């Protein structure tokens, strides 16, 4: 619809930039094509397609509308073959917003290198869950999203923490608007598993080995959450949802200009959810607030300030799994899916809040620079009590474990980087040079010396949670950790021929963790980055990349000699093909990949059998593991009304013993989520559904009473999802989501501290949504 423009004539670059800004649209263009040109003045209330063609009046340029992107070109009569990946400067550094695109596929993406590239142009496996996907399938938090992310497998530690694997690894890398958080363990990372989606445009997952922009981190993948932003036109909605197990949700989201001119814009979102659950006596209130304001200091310098807040507050949290595998005498337990071994009062409450500011400046080169300041808090308040151990015993009694952990981490970050194009051998390339600093400080109390507590319960079979709460006594531990990461990085993207793009870059890292443990230093470690992308057709590209990453070990991972293991390292080797269709409206990928880990922390069993250095009591051993696997995906428009996202991933990871490892992640998985928007008589109705399939998965757990190892198997199963929406009104729609249609019962955890969690049973969600 119509928009208030005011773009004075200037360097074509500047105007395209200024237009992008004023229209809330991504504007892509070629540096060399707009260099010795200027725009015609646009002024007043207009529609963007009118506005842009008017701005380009006399420049010899054509416009290509693509969703929330417009890509600007200046055709020649000459042309001798097309440079599909030509260096393109871009108006929004985070990428193309997906909100409103109507699509399940992303537009452009800055996750891999900090350069704005399309999935076809990025030589790494990159999956994105778009704003519409989140809406259509009711994905209200990061857990929901990960469960619909192809190639991810979500598993339960306990009712209030999940594990996300990719490619053989627990994912432990989270970003916001491209800034890494600190997640060395559950100290620094309270709430990461639980972020509400009310404040996000999309989530982007870069599978592989992501050292280049994460710095120090886990192998497997990075998860990158992109915040919602303000708009120059007014808009918002209010949403109310009601689902199984007294699950209630409400949401308000407002955005728009805040001054007659347009130079200060804001966006505000509040979301409140309160849900009981299929698990007995578990409940959880979650509260979220967010505000961002933009200010234009001048047409080419913008300042952004913002804050967000989320509180996750449960009753009946478990500590490990939902129930124990074996009873006292060694038999497997059969329990209702409702069973929950948390105490009534037991709670693993987790909170997060951020204050952040940035400054973005267009330089005249079409170079642009950016300074991000972040202050992040991750806090936890955790009085846990859960039935634990080989129980029941024969007379139906059991025993509780109770411990209390409270704490906060405070983090501060500075990220500064510069991005721009440049001529080299008569061709146009681009570069990102950046540097970053973070300091975080974890601070906690632990309680475990309980005073005069009777931790037996007289009834396993009807466990209700209804046990007393212990006197926590005085703190048993003070935690005081300081981590400090400093990084510098540079990537260059050369356009070597009309169809070869070479990527060369690296990050140099310095990592100090200081505290109550022996200091852990790592200094001037080089993380390399090499990538190539060869065009074959208008449609398909091949690509390879060698990417790297390391995480210095936790301080208790020491060895025979009580020396800290070297940093857990991994390279990912990838070759693949990517295809692109309907002018970027649909993408496909088929990738082959291999990760080589080294210094993987493993037990050291022969030492452990009988420790012989009084120094260390439980040594480890830094071994080598490999992932070998392949992956296929598709996202976007199959036909006009029809969207999909779907993937297939095969994996096996083995360590030096030769044995398989991560054997709880299935070797094979498939995802397919789709919706269809009818046309004509039924054009107000979208229908969708999805299906999630995986193969055999198992664990070795030790049955302690019978003194033997047992394999535990989850046989391959399907989960099926269904979805309907109706736009009753220009401004009001209603929606139904049914999940786990065939009420499959399966396990989300078998083996974690000898326990088991169940997957969600069939559940529905009804919601309405009201757009002002
Ligand atoms: C150090 C703290 C930083 C605070 C940052 C939080 C900012 C919160 O901003 C709240 C403002 O939100 C703006 C919502 O936009 C809607 C305004 O619409 C104008 C009303 O429309 C009437 C006529 O158009
Ligand atoms: C063990 C659980 C089994 C549950 C199975 C349920 C299967 C039936 O699902 C379909 C439900 O259809 C109900 C129709 O309701 C229509 C949605 O209306 C939304 C209300 O809009 C609000 C207006 O302000």
UniProtKB/Swiss-Prot annotation:
PANTHER family assigned: FERRICHROME IRON RECEPTOR-RELATED, HYDROXAMATE SIDEROPHORE RECEPTOR FHUE
Superkingdom per UniProt: Bacteria
Transmembrane helix as UniProt keyword: no
Listed CDD domains: ligand_gated_channel
Gene name as annotated: fpvA
Family: Belongs to the TonB-dependent receptor family.
Places the protein is found: Cell outer membrane
Keywords attached to this entry: Cell outer membrane, Ion transport, Iron, Iron transport, Membrane, Receptor, Signal, TonB box, Transmembrane, Transmembrane beta strand, Transport
Residue span of motif TonB C-terminal box: 755-772
InterPro entries cross-referenced by the UniProt entry: Plug_dom (IPR012910), Plug_dom_sf (IPR037066), Secretin/TonB_short_N (IPR011662), TonB-dep_rcpt-like (IPR039426), TonB-dep_rcpt_b-brl (IPR000531), TonB_rcpt_b-brl_sf (IPR036942), TonB_rcpt_CS (IPR010917), TonB_sidphr_rcpt (IPR010105)
Family matches, as NCBIfam families: TonB-siderophor (TIGR01783)
Domain called TBDR beta-barrel: residue spans: 233-772
Start and end residues of each TBDR plug domain: 118-228
Protein name: Ferripyoverdine receptor
Pfam (any one): Plug
Record's note on what induces expression: By the siderophore, pyoverdine, and under iron starvation conditions.
Keyword NADP: no
Function, in words: Receptor for the siderophore ferripyoverdine.
One GO CC term, this protein: membrane
Membrane topology summary: Multi-pass membrane protein
């Amino acid at each position: 619809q119509e928009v208030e423009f005011d773009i004075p004539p200037q360097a074509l670059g500047s105007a395209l930039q200024e237009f992008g800004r004023q229209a809330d649209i991504q504007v892509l263009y070629r540096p060399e094509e707009v260099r010795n040109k200027r725009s015609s003045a646009i002024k007043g209330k207009l529609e963007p397609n009118q506005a842009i063609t008017e701005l380009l009046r006399g420049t010899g340029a054509s416009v290509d509308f693509q969703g929330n992107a417009i890509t600007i070109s200046v055709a020649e009569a000459a042309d001798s073959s097309v440079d599909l990946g030509a260096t393109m400067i871009t108006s929004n550094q985070l990428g193309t917003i997906t909100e409103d695109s109507g699509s399940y596929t992303p537009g452009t993406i800055a996750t891999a290198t900090r350069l704005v590239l399309t999935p076809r142009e990025t030589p790494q496996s990159i999956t994105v869950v778009t704003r519409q996907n989140m809406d259509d399938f009711g994905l209200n938090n990061i857990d929901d999203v990960m469960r619909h992310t192809p190639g991810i497998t979500v598993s339960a530690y306990d009712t209030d923490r999940n594990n996300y694997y990719a490619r053989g690894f627990s994912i432990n890398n989270f970003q916001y608007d491209g800034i890494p958080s600190t997640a060395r363990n559950v100290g620094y990372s309270a709430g990461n598993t639980l972020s509400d989606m009310a404040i996000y445009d999309r989530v982007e997952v870069l599978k592989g080995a992501t050292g280049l922009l994460t710095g120090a981190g886990s192998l497997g993948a990075t998860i990158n959450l992109i915040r919602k932003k303000p708009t120059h036109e007014f808009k918002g909605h209010v949403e109310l949802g009601a689902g199984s197990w007294d699950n209630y949700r409400s949401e308000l989201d407002v955005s728009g200009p805040l001054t007659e001119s347009g130079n200060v814009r804001g966006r505000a979102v509040a979301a409140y959810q309160d849900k009981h659950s299929f698990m007995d006596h578990y409940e959880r209130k979650t509260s979220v607030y967010y505000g961002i304001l933009e200010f234009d200091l001048n047409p080419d310098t913008m300042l952004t300030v913002g804050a967000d807040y989320q509180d996750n507050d449960p009753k009946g949290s478990g500590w490990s799994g939902s129930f124990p595998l074996f009873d006292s005498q060694g038999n497997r337990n059969d329990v209702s899916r409702s069973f929950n071994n948390g105490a009534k009062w037991s709670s693993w409450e987790q909170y997060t809040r951020t204050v952040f500011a940035n400054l973005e400046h267009n330089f005249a080169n079409g170079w642009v620079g950016k300074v991000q300041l972040d202050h992040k808090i991750n806090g936890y308040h955790a009085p846990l009590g859960a039935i634990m151990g080989d129980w029941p015993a024969p007379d139906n009694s059991a025993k509780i474990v109770a411990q209390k952990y409270t704490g906060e981490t405070k983090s501060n970050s500075l990220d500064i980087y510069l991005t721009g194009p440049f001529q080299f051998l008569g061709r146009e390339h681009e570069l990102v040079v950046g540097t970053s600093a973070s300091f975080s400080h974890w601070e906690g109390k632990s309680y475990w010396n309980l005073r005069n507590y009777d931790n037996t319960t007289d009834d396993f079979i009807n466990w209700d949670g209804d046990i007393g709460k212990p006197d926590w006594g005085t703190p048993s531990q003070y935690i005081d950790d300081k981590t400090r990461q400093l990084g510098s990085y540079m990537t260059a993207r050369f356009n070597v021929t009309d169809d070869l793009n070479l990527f060369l870059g690296g990050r140099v890292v310095d990592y100090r963790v200081t505290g109550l443990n022996p200091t852990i230093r790592e200094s001037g470690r080089f993380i390399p980055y090499v990538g190539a992308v060869y065009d074959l057709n208008d449609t398909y590209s091949v690509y390879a990349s060698y990417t790297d990453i390391f995480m210095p070990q936790d301080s208790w991972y020491r060895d025979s000699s009580n020396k800290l293991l070297e940093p857990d390292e991994g390279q990912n080797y990838e070759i693949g093909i990517k295809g692109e269709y309907l002018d970027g409206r649909l993408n496909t990928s088929l990738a082959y990949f291999e990760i080589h880990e080294e210094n993987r922390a493993e037990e050291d069993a022969l030492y452990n059998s009988k420790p012989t250095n009084p120094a260390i009591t439980y040594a480890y051993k830094g071994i080598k593991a490999k992932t070998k696997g392949y992956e296929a995906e598709i996202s976007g428009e199959l036909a006009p009304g029809w969207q999909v996202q779907a993937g297939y991933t095969h994996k096996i990871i083995r360590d030096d013993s030769g044995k398989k490892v991560s054997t709880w992640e299935p070797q094979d998985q498939l995802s397919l989520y789709t919706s269809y928007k009818f046309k004509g008589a039924l054009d107000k109705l979208t229908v969708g559904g999805g299906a999630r399939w995986q193969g055999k998965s198992w664990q070795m757990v030790y049955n302690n009473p019978r003194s033997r190892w047992e394999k535990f198997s989850q046989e391959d199963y399907w989960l099926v999802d269904l979805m309907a929406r109706y736009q009753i009104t220009d401004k009001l729609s209603a929606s139904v989501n049914v999940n786990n249609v065939f009420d499959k019962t399966y396990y989300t955890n078998i083996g974690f501290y000898t326990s088991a969690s169940y997957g969600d049973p069939r559940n529905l969600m009804f919601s309405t949504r009201w757009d002002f």
